[PDB]
Amino acid sequence: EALGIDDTRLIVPVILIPVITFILYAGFASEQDNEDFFDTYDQRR
Amino acid sequence: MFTLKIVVYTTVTFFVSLFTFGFLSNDASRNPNRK
Amino acid sequence: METLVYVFLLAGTLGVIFFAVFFRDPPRIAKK
Amino acid sequence: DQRLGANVSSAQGPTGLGKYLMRSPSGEIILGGETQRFWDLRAPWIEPLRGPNGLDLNKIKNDIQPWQERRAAEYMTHAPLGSLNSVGGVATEINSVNYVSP
Amino acid sequence: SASAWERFCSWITSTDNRLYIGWFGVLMIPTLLTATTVYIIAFVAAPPVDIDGIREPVAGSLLYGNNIITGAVIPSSASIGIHFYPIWEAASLDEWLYNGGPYQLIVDHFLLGVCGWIGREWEFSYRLGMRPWISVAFTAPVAAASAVFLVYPIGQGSFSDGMPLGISGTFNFMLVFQAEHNILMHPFHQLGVAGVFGGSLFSAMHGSLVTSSLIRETTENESANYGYKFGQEEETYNIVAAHGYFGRLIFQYASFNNSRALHFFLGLWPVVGIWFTALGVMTMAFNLNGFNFNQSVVDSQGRVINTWADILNRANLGMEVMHERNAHNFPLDL
Amino acid sequence: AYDFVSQELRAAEDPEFETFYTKNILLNEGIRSWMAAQDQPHENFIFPEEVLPRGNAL
Amino acid sequence: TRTVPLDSSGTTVILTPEQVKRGKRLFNSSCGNCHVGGITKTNPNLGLEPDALSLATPARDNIDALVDYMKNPTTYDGLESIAELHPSVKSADIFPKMRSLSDEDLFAIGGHILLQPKLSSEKWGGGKIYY
Amino acid sequence: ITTEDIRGLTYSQVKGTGLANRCPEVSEQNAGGTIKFADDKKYKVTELCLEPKSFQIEEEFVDTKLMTRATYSLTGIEGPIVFKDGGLTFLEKGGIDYAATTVQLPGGERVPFLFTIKELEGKFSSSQVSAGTELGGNFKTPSYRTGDMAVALPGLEADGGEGQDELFAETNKVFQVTDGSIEMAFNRVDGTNGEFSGVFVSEQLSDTDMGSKAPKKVLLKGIVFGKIEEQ
Amino acid sequence: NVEYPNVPYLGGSDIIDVNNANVRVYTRLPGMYPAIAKKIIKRAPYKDINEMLEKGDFTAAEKDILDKYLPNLTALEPAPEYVIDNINNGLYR
Amino acid sequence: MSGPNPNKQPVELNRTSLFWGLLLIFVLAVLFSSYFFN
Amino acid sequence: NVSVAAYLAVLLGTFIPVVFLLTLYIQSESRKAAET
Amino acid sequence: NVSVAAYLAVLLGTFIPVVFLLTLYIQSESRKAAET
Amino acid sequence: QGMFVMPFMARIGVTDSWGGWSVTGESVANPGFWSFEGVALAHIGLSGLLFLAAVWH
Ligand code: CLA
Ligand code: CLA
Ligand SMILES: CCCCCCCCCCCCCCCC(=O)OC[C@H](CO[C@@H]1O[C@H](CS(=O)(=O)O)[C@@H](O)[C@H](O)[C@H]1O)OC(=O)CCCCCCCCCCCCCCC
Ligand code: OEX
Ligand SMILES: [Cl-]
DSSP states (O other), X not given: OGGGOOSGGGHHHHHHHHHHHXXXXXXXXXXXXXXXXXXXXOOOO | OHHHHHXXXXXXXXXXXXXXXXXXXXXXXXXXXXX | OHHHHHHHHHHXXXXXXXXXXXXXXXXXXXXX | OTTXXXXXTTOBOTTSSBSSEEEOTTSOEEEOSXXXXXXXXXXXXXXXTEXXXXXXXXXXXXXXXXXXXXXXXXHTTSOSXXXXXXXXXXXXXXXXXXXXXX | OOOHHHHHHHHHTOSOSSSOOHHHHHHHHHHHHHHHHHHHHHHHSOOOBOSSSSSOOBOOSGGGXXXXXXXXXXXXXXXXXXXXXXXXXXXXHHHHHHTTHHHHHHHHHHHHHHHHHHHHHHHHHHHTTOOOOHHHHHHHHHHHHHIIIIIHHHHHTOGGGSOOEESHHHHHHHHHHHHXXXXXXXXXXXXXXXXXXXXXXXXXXXXXXXXXXXXXXXXXXXXXXXXXXXXXXXXXXXXXXXXXXXXXHTOTTSSOSOHHHHHHHHHHHHHHHHHHHHHHHHHHHTTEEOOOOTTOOBOSSOOBOOOHHHHHHHHHHHHHTTSSTTOOOSSSOO | OOOOHHHHHHXXXXXXXXXXXXXXXXXXXXXXXXXXXXXXXXXTOOOOTTTXXXXXXX | OOEEXXXXXXXXXXXXXXXXXHHHHXXXXXXXXXXXXXXXXXXXXXXXXXXXXXXXXXOOOSHHHHHHHHHSOXXXXXXXXXXTTSOOSTTTTTSGGGGGOOHHXXXXXXXHHHHGGGSSTTOSSSGGGGO | OOHHHHHHSOTTTTTTTSOSSSOOOOOTTSOSOOBOOOSSXXXXXXXXXXXXXXOEEEOOEEEOEEOSSSOOOEEEEEEEEEEXXXXXXXXXXXXXOEEEEEEEOTTSOEEEEEEEOTTOEEEESSSSBOTTOEEEEEEEEOOSSXXXXXXXXXXXXXXXXXXXXXXXXXXXXXXXXXXXXXXXXEEEEOSSSSEEEEEEEEEEEBOOTTXXXXXXXXXXXXXXXXXXXXX | OOOOSOOSTTTTXXXXXXXXXXXXXXXXXXXXXXXXXXXXXXXXXXXXXXXXXXXXXXXXXXXXXXXXXXXXXXXXXXXXXXXXXXXXXXOOO | OOSOOTTOOOOOOOHHHXXXXXXXXXXXXXXXXXXXXX | OOOTTHHXXXXXXXXXXXXXXXXXXXXXXXXXXHHO | OOOTTHHHHHHHXXXXXXXXXXXXXXXXXXXXXXXX | OOOSSHHHHHHTTOOBOTTSBXXXXXXOSOOOSOSXXXXXXXXXXXXXXXXXXXXXX
């Protein structure tokens, strides 16, 4: 049983919720600069 | 018991998704020495 | 009936913790 | 006990449960006693003697190969219980057995 | 101007919240609240649990005849073992209560919550611009809680062997652990005892040395604590005076001249001690027991001359033959 | 603080009533009975195998 | 002591200390896992206490009977052999640890088994009670 | 979920599924047969399985909820079927013939009971096994637990002449062997093999706490299966 | 139970009572274990000694072994608390 | 905002009121103790 | 004889308002003393 | 079972020092308030 | 038995309990959330929420 899933209705939230969170995160990331930097971390937000 | 299981799966997925996509959101920049 | 006393004491301890956290004396720097 | 005259499937334990063979929480025939927590064990010396309902009593009384007897007799003594000074057995044993499992 | 997710991340990682949430707190707060809720309601009103799996339930809640001391959330059934036992894996809710499912729920949520607490301590160390090794210090009690709640059940193959969520249950766990593993003779537990005793010794020593050499800043009619103002620049006590007193107490380099090295030692001794005792419990989960010195002294003929280890062995045998009544049908305890 | 009296009364009146405290009491009995013979040799405690408390004995 | 019975008639043999030490070592190496303390971890109804060895057919309270049991083990009644289940030089292919034991090794093991009932009495075969 | 369905599956896909304690019944494609008995060949009953459903306890008869998980079915019960007093009686001698299970009355209380048909001397109607024959008899239910002090109160055993006599029945753990009656009917009988299938109705007593609590009667109505072959 | 008068013969004395004792008590008598005692325990309930000598399937050599131990052997009323534990009885040392 | 509430007023209780309250409570306890106990 | 838990009623109903009055009086007296 | 008059012990020993601390705190706060 | 708020809970619908019984004497296999215990816990949670709201206001 993959991920403890025995009913196919359980897959709907497990896949769906990360999609919506990724949509919000993708709006955030599209707001960003997104070019390479030479440093230990990116100070641009 | 299935309704409780799907509610718990939804809640765990929601909070783990928030955790995962929050630490992907340039968490290293969120420090007082930035800029 | 002592279960009620135990619950009352535990709830009072938790209320003391709650008030000590959220209604604490706010720390401020003095002008010394 | 099956070979030396003792009906293992009807022997009631001290608490009314199975002393030798009992019923698993999923409904299979498993070994009784305190080893009921280890009913998920798969071993090459016991799988030929295991049906879809757990341990098959007929295959237990009929289909035992001697090498399985040797394996089970060997494994029951060198249990993974030892000490830091390499003393075998439980912590309440005397200093005569020198074994800690790899 | 910013995106909604950016504002959400700014609120989550905000230093203006009364209690810092952070991303580790996103995982920590609901897990800890779930564990706290289930623990409170199961400690007050939960039916007895068949911990040994032999259909002889043990009462642990206040409504079933327990006080604060004897009350506990009983570990799960030995029939369950270390099988995953949520509510939905039971036929009914009362079957879940009978087999000790609440113990698994509380333990899993509590371990996730304390991992989140470690991460959250790191996170608010990072947001404040301070050094992030308080979480390393907190890993030691987390290691001990994990050893007694998850690793020992993993080693012994049953969640019934984890430490009960109570006081008398904790004492029972200690006694059975001593009977079956002889933890007192285990050098890692001895290192842990040295860690806690030394931590108490060093806490009292540092507190007494600081309180002894406080710089006079108050009058006789007020507490000496008001001589220190929150946020002052100068030091509130004479470090040289305490160093001189402690150097003349034992010998002149038994003290730490450096306050930073002294505080590193303070944070190092008990953390390492608890790490070692937690790892000792983790190793005894897989039956790597403590030192066995039974019958180590014999006479010229070979008669056993007892030692203190043999009297300790007698006590361990007394605890061994009485623990888990009617759950042993075989001579050895393998 | 060896015992809670009400717990012992309820365990005596109800054989099915059991807490971890009662198990601790039984473990203490085991310690005493299996330890006193060699721990206090001046008393010359001779305990037969039938008076020694055992988990399988009951 | 170092004096154990040899024959069933009543003949006794005086054991050398080297024999006693070697028998103790071989008994702790080859028999300890099932005969720690003079008991049997796999069949607790029988043990290595002198009363169990003497009240048997044949009686195993001498050197030669113990050596014969290590060569041809039988049941407690004696009619049925247990060479498949019990280690023996007949079944050295079944139990690989027996292939190094010679007749002097069995002599030393039997001497150690007979010597222990006279050594810290009531502890040999008494189980965990006499610890 | 017949015997062919039992033998077709391996243990890898039955573990953790609950399909093992199902009391496999015969199908209608193999039913409609009969089993006869000769006057010279000895016969025995093997693989007698019983799966109880709808546990009811009188305390009127109120339905209960099961506390244990899948440890309530009996399987593999063997015993000789022996001619006695005109008919032929089934003597129970082996197999998993006991199940220590706990059920909860709808008031919060738990009543453990031992579902058993031990020492059964049941005889069944007619001299053949077909669709309609019923097997009934009386079994002997052993106590839930097996085999002098109130060590809690040393001052209770000082009262003089009457010491710890109030707490005597709880101290006196008495092994009590209650009796019960089992009535099973055979709905379908396989003719090729000695297999029969049907339902069973059981009435027995619950735990006595070794003679400390009143035994409540338990009513069990499930399904039954068994094989009749050579002895 | 608290009170049970018929328990010096469960291995506590020389005379051994059948159908109430474990198989471990037949190890005191040579030649009575693990054979013979199995026949006693399997068909447990006996009225007296002669019922054991007749209903048991004892071979002539086993009958001689029985003849060696007449006086330290008896058959009293059966107690179900000890009938259920005549093979294991929980004793292991 | 979160700060000085203008409606903050001090609360007084002089010694006469303290003694009257103590007398009232103790006399009420004396009166009603016989009825609570029975 | 005499019903129990009435000791709790009598003693708590005596103490709590007495506690309230004593606290009020001490608070008022200390405010007056700080006014000086 | 549970001994009576221990309710009185627990509740009074909980209340009285709590009463003392509450009175001290309120007195101190009112003295500070009148110091202003 | 001196029940005071139980009559008012039973007056307008709440008659079952999580213990499996009803005040009419019948047995309830599936009580649902709105039992006596459910109402009591809902009131406790409502009290906590109103307490937090009072603190905020
Ligand atoms: C004077 C004698 C003595 C001393 C000093 C110790 C000392 C110790 N023993 Mg020990 N022991 C002794 C005698 C002694 N023992 C005897 C005689 C026996 C035999 C009966 C034992 C048997 C024994 C066992 C069996 C075990 C110990 C363990 C321990 C260690 C405890 C670790 C601990 O609690 O901190 C670590 C901290 C924690 C466990 C707490 C976790 C905190 C979590 C992360 C957060 C909790 C938050 C909480 C839920 C909410 C707080 C409130 C909220 C409002 C904020 C410690 C070193 C244990 C050990 O080694 O550790 C694994 C252990 O398992 N002992
Ligand atoms: C979501 C809201 C909600 C709900 C559904 C309930 C539900 C319930 N409550 Mg409850 N309660 C609530 C909020 C709620 N409560 C709040 C916020 C409080 C704190 C004040 C309380 C305090 C409370 C107490 C103290 C008690 C209950 C009780 C009950 C139960 C019986 C109800 C009953 O008989 O009422 C009957 C209600 C009335 C007769 C009031 C009628 C309204 C008056 C007559 C209006 C008249 C003035 C009006 C303005 C007229 C002008 C308008 C007109 C022109 C139309 C029931 C389960 C009882 C119980 O069983 O306890 C568990 C009980 O004793 N509740
Ligand atoms: C068998 C050998 C191989 C295995 C053993 C390996 C040895 C381990 C220790 C060596 C590595 C660590 C070096 C010292 C640590 C350090 O941070 O140095 C920095 C300072 C050292 O002196 C400070 O040093 C400073 C100078 S400097 O910057 O460090 O160069 C100086 O400014 C300051 O005044 C001075 O106090 O730290 C300290 O003050 C702590 C010293 C003690 C810490 C190590 C000793 C172990 C203590 C017990 C361990 C806990 C057990 C508890 C169980 C109950
Ligand atoms: O429960 Mn806790 O410790 Ca695991 O081994 Mn077996 O079981 Mn019991 O003994 Mn050892
Ligand atoms: Cl066992």
